[PDB]
Each structure stands twice: as structure tokens, then as C-alpha cells.
């Protein structure tokens with residue numbers, strides 16, 4: 216798990232996201248979709264997005280970005296004690312949305328990329344390390360639920 220010091224960094228970094236949850240949410244999804252087109256196909260409500268221009272101009276995409284980051288933030292604030300918050304998400308994404316754990320890896324890297332892109336020189340080595348560990352814990356706990364379900 217993460218140390219108290221690492222959790223403090225994680226939530227300090229998250230402060231950046233909460234100042235513009237919609238903007239960060241939108242960029243994360245755009246980075247995910249442009250970098251891994253196959254992911255777009257998992258969203259029937261975003262498959263109509265042919266170009267990045269259409270993506271950036273989609274208010275619903277920004278809306279979902281907020282839903283996604285608000286959920287992740289709630290989980291992060293639990294500092295590891297997220298069984299109740301994480302279980303339902305793991306279940307919906309494996310059973311309903313059919314999202315391979317690989318796509319969670321993609322969005323994890325996307326979050327790291329967007330933080331550096333929006334806050335160049337303001338996302339330190341220590342901060343990236345803490346945030347990375349938090350995202351891996353998240354991904355690892357979901358992976359456990361995925362194995363339980365036998366979802367690949």
C-alpha cells in the first residue's frame with residue numbers, strides 16, 4: 216500500500232483536478248480515445264465521434280469525464296479502504312461494459328499524461344510516484360474483482 220506521506224501527495228495532486236474537474240475529465244478521455252481508438256468502440260454514446268474536434272466539442276463527453284473523475288476522486292479519498300466504492304465499478308465495467316483491465320491501464324497512463332500536460336513543471340517526481348502507486352492499487356483491486364468474475 217501507500218504510506219501516509221504518499222497518500223498526502225496523492226490528495227494534494229488531486230487538488231489540481233478538483234479545480235477543473237470537467238477540463239481534466241475531458242482531456243483524459245480524449246487522450247484515451249485518440250491514443251487507443253478501440254476504447255471508443257466500448258461507448259455507443261461516443262462512437263459517433265469521428266475526429267478530436269468533435270470530441271473537444273462534445274458536451275456529453277465532458278459530462279462523462281466529470282462522472283468518471285468524481286468517482287475516482289471519491290475512491291482516492293478513501294486512501295485504500297475503498298472496497299464498497301470499488302466493487303460496484305469493477306462489476307459494472309466487467310459485466311456490463313466489458314472493459315478489459317488493459318483499458319484501465321490505458322486510462323491510468325492517460326491521467327498521468329494529462330497532469331503533466333496541464334501542469335508542466337508542477338507535477339514533481341515524488342507526486343508522479345505517489346499518484347502512480349494509487350492508480351496501480353486501484354487497477355490491482357479491480358483486477359482482483361475481474362478474476363473473481365473470470366472476466367478477460
Ligand code: HEM
Pocket residue numbers: 254255257258259260282283284286287303304307308312314318319322
Ligand atoms: C479511472 C477509471 C474509471 C472510472 C472511475 C470509471 C467510472 C465510471 C462511472 C462512475 C460510470 C457510470 C456508472 C457504471 O456504469 O458503473 C462509468 C460508465 C462507463 N464506463 Fe467507466 N470508468 C473508468 C474507466 C473506464 C474505461 C477505461 C472504459 C472503457 C474504455 C470505461 C467504459 C465505460 C462505459 C462504456 C460506461 C457506460 C457509459 C454510458 O453508456 O453511459 N470506463 N464509468
